[PDB]
Amino acid sequence: IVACDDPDFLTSYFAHSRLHHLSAWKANLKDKFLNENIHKYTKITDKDTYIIFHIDFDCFFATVAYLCRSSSFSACDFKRDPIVVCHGTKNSDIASCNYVARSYGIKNGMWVSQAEKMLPNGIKLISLPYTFEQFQLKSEAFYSTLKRLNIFNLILPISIDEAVCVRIIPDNIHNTNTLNARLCEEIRQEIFQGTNGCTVSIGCSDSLVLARLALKMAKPNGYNITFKSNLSEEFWSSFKLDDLPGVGHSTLSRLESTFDSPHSLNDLRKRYTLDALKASVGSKLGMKIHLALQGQDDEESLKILYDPKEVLQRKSLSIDINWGIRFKNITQVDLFIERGCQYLLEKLNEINKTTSQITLKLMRRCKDAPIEPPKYMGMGRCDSFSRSSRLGIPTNEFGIIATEMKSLYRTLGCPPMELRGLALQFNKLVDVGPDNNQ
């Protein structure tokens, strides 16, 4: 057991945190794309007509954890048992659940306690541990397979288990659904063989947004080809409002209040007006949704195709720790901040950059919230506070950055015992060139 005032805390927390792993994996995939394309002119141009193959592992962690499960779980049956991946037994996040579990209403991100209550009597939830290294190994096989097939002009990493793959179609060639179905089946089979049993689904379209929706439609373990010319009421009727990219719970709530609780993208499509949309959810998001309901990408989303180097370049660096934060005094807080600064500066030096601006963000227990919340070591209900500072001279000096971070904490006034979370951010990064003469 490692407490937050123990020097090993950051290492142990990050070693256990699937959300840390996900961000670290995504960051590494981005750096790798940039390094492998340092000299290639890697970008779709306006001259190209393209097809999007949006490819994603089905129940990634659950699939891999099951395939690599220990002897204690040998008799577990992936097609018949409800399976989740999590650390704990009660207020522990379900990071992944298989589709048997989803058939009972279980969803990623539920707590185990919640998920158990959805099972009929006699049916047992199987909980598998995380297998972080094997998650990474399976992803390696995935990305290696995509490259080996030599059918994509551009392979864009989205995450450990997801990529957007672009095929340019010369319009001396005649693309067909049959050719695209063959490609989907090739991809699916080769990844199945290369991952030793993981399944991917695939959405295939002529827009990013349609490929994403097609992917949702294809799951589990299938593919869906829906081009703009194929659109129909049957298609839009199949989606919830938050299936749209950019629509989370808060945008969901807003659209439901504004448009009389639409229950499908078809409902929304028939009811909205661009102007009422913008008023509900904002100008840019409103325009994005409008275009999405036409099967069309917005300018911002298209940047990944036309300048992936820029989109995938990292522009800030941070850590967030909002679990296990229980400090008795300001000395221990300050030492934790210093440990976080050290960790961040290692990351900053690995990419050979300096920072010109930093931010400290904290979570403070709400005045009326229990000191020990429902989730063990959780942040519980908090108020958030943030403050930033320009450094003037770009720097990677620990002395300067750590002192300023600790000062930022001081200015926010949070008593150490009330602290429940901390985020440390380098907001602006500056390249380090060969010329460092003042």
Add this chain to the structure above:
DNA sequence: GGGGTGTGGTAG
């Protein structure tokens, strides 16, 4: 027109 801040949301 240019600049800034803290906050909020979504992704994956």
Add this chain to the structure above:
DNA sequence: ATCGCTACCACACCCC
């Protein structure tokens, strides 16, 4: 028990 991360866009409200 249990590991509630992190990047980046968008916005509302300030300055000139």
